[PDB]
Copies of this chain bind each other. A is one copy, B any other.
Amino acid sequence: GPGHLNEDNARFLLLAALIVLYLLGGAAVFSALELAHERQAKQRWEERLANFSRGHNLSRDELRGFLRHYEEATRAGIRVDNVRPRWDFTGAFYFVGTVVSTIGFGMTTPATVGGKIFLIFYGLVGCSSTILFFNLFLERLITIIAYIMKSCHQRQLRRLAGWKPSVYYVMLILCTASILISCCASAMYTPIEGWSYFDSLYFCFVAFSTIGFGDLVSSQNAHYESQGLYRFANFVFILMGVCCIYSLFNVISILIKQSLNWILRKMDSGCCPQCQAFAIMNNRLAE
């Protein structure tokens, strides 16, 4: 039964239901995957706290106050090991780069009322500009791929909007580009930041996808070797990876929309008895 509703509303409802099921399944998987590690780490921390309390003769009240003070310090940008100044010009540049790309690592956060108000306004404008930049970069990359494909075809036969690349081809190119960027960034990060290669790849995916957990943040140590060049390389790699991964997300979203249309059509056609865009859309008028 079609349900006397249009195709688009059915697509919206199906996508919402699928996302809810995906969230439930992912939550179950993650819990079953690392609840034990959580509990072990908590028990280890409790053992360490008890040992420290016994070994230096302090109750839990003074230790609680000290830990609260240290939490305030960390929120202010203090770490046990050496860390770069949090709100110098370079640190502020890192912070605004994280805000502008909606990454938000969290190592640098505003702590003043004026700071937070300016964060709101600046983030609004900059995030809009950055989404526009990502869309423009995706369009430019698609045009480049089309031009290169045309040139290669003309060279092959000798030996633009006409023959444009398909969605699958662009998705494959974006996938391999993201893999290469992540591999190079991890190759740089592993011997510099001291992380493992897998940890570097995980951080690369976290930063590129604009998730920005904040557990791993690059270029945060107080001093580096060739510090300016390292910072420039880190910025370039993060920007390139974020652009590539965002374009990949958009292309996979197009593919998922195609798949959603297909499954909706199949269910409407022969699965009922078997129980047992905005640019040409909203920008077009304002022109």
Contact = CB atoms under 8 A, between A and B. Distances in A.
A1 to B, nearest CB: 22
A27 B95 CA distance: 7
Contacts of A215: 75, 106, 109
Given A52-B66, A62-B56, A116-B198, A28 B89 contact: yes
B110 A282 contact: no
* Copies per assembly: 2
Interface stretch (A136-144, A183-191, A218-226, A265-273): A136-144
Nearest to A67: B80
B76 A71 contact: no
B77 A129 contact: no
A271 B63 CA distance: 66
Interface in A130-167: 130-133, 135-140, 142-143, 164-167
Interface in A40-71: 41-42, 44-45, 48-49, 52, 56-58, 62, 64, 66-71
A85 to B, nearest CB: 8
A232 to B, nearest CB: 13
Interface in A81-110: 85-93, 95-100, 102-106, 109-110
A96 B166 contact: no
Interface of A: 8-9, 11-12, 15-16, 18-19, 22-24, 26-31, 33-35, 37-38, 41-42, 44-45, 48-49, 52, 56-58, 62, 64, 66-80, 85-93, 95-100, 102-106, 109-116, 118-120, 122-133, 135-140, 142-143, 164-168, 170, 198, 202, 205-206, 209-215, 248-258, 260, 277-283, 285-287
